[PDB]
């Protein structure tokens, strides 16, 4: 059945020339920071970070999340706790891909 | 709980210069083709295609799916019915981003 809710999906790729250990530190710190946000950002219905484990793929980090509506996605996006979490990627990030869709 | 399974998430961006009418035809056709695959491809545990509704984002299509393991993801990826679905995007695709992660 149709939920009338929104999935916010983001994939990130880090630069190729970042050392392995730095990619791991960044990815682990970002995953922890993001997954702690529900205690601080009330509109998050579900959130998780997945780290790529397929060596045939080149992107690094997936953020899978659910919100009631797009206003709530925007509330989350600019929330100070979320902005802090996103800065974790600032030095190493190469690309961001995002789709927001209804389910 | 940890399921011992894999999420296969793919986002697509179509070329900027494709007329929006053909972008839409492609997006709809791809969504329909992917969503018909579970009846043909038994290893798909969950699959859905999301079409972007956020005009602040620039990627057009999300594929969200679940499999038992990466061997099954690869079985799905190479399956003739899946390849045909993927070809729907061939003429207009600009970028593909993918992360496969354990849950």
Count CB neighbours of A4 within 10 A.
Answer: 9
DSSP assignments along A33-92, one per residue: HHHTGGGT-TT-SEEEEEE---TT----EEEEEEESSHHHHHHHHH-HHHHHHHHTTTTT
Backbone angles phi, psi at B55, to 5 degrees: -70, -10
C-alpha triplet A7, B31, B53: angle, nearest 5°: 40
Backbone angles phi, psi at A45, to 5 degrees: -85, -40
Domain parsing of chain B, residue ranges? 4-103
- Walk across the sheet containing A6-14 and list its strands: A46-51, A61-67, A6-14, A93-102
Interface test with A, best of B28, B99, B101 (most A CBs within 10 A): B99
Q: What does the alpha-carbon distance between residue B17 and residue B23 come to, in Å, rounded to a whole number?
A: 10
How many A×B Cβ pairs under 8 Å?
A: 88
- The tokens describing B24, both together, are 């839409």
Question: Resolution, in Å, please?
Answer: 1.9
| CB pair distance less than 8 Å for A62 and B7 | yes
Among A48, A50, A100, the residue with its CB nearest the CB of B53 is A100
- The tokens describing A24, both together, are 């791991």
What was the structure determination method?
Answer: X-ray
Residues on B contacting A at a C-beta cutoff of 8 Å: 7, 9, 11, 13, 48, 50-54, 57-62, 64, 70, 73, 95, 97-103
Give the dihedral sign, CA B54/B49/A81/A85. Answer: negative
- The tokens describing A100, both together, are 């927001």
| CB pair distance less than 8 Å for A101 and B11 | no
Spatial neighbors of A20 by CB under 8 A, at least 6 apart, are none
Strands B46-51 and B6-14: unpaired
Q: Which residue is listed with tokens 């946000």? A: A37
Q: What does the alpha-carbon distance between residue A18 and residue A4 come to, in Å, rounded to a whole number?
A: 40
| A92 neighbors A33 (Cβ within 8 angstroms) | no
Q: Which residue is listed with tokens 């009631």? A: A68
Task: Please state, in angstroms and as integers, the Cα–Cα distance from residue B77 to each residue in A8, A56, B65, B73, B96, following that order.
Answer: 24, 12, 12, 6, 14
Task: Please state, in angstroms and as integers, the Cα–Cα distance from residue B15 to each residue in A13, B25, B58, B93, following that order.
Answer: 20, 14, 10, 6
- Can you name the CATH fold of A4-103? Alpha-Beta Plaits (3.30.70)
Three-state secondary-structure class, residue B78: helix
Helix axis angle for A20-35 and A80-87, nearest 10°, is: 170
Closest CA to B58 of B22, B10, B94, B13: B13
């Amino acid at each position: 059945y149709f939920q009338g809710m929104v999935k916010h999906i983001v994939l990130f790729k880090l630069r190729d020339d970042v050392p392995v250990e730095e990619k791991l530190v960044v990815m682990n710190s970002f995953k922890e920071a993001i997954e702690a946000l529900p205690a601080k950002i009330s509109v998050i219905r579900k959130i998780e970070v997945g780290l790529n484990m397929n060596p045939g793929e080149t992107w690094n980090i997936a953020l899978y999340s659910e919100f009631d509506n797009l206003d709530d996605v925007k509330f989350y996006a600019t929330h100070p706790e979320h902005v802090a979490a996103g800065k974790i990627l600032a030095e190493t990030k190469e690309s961001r891909a995002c789709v927001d869709y209804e389910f």
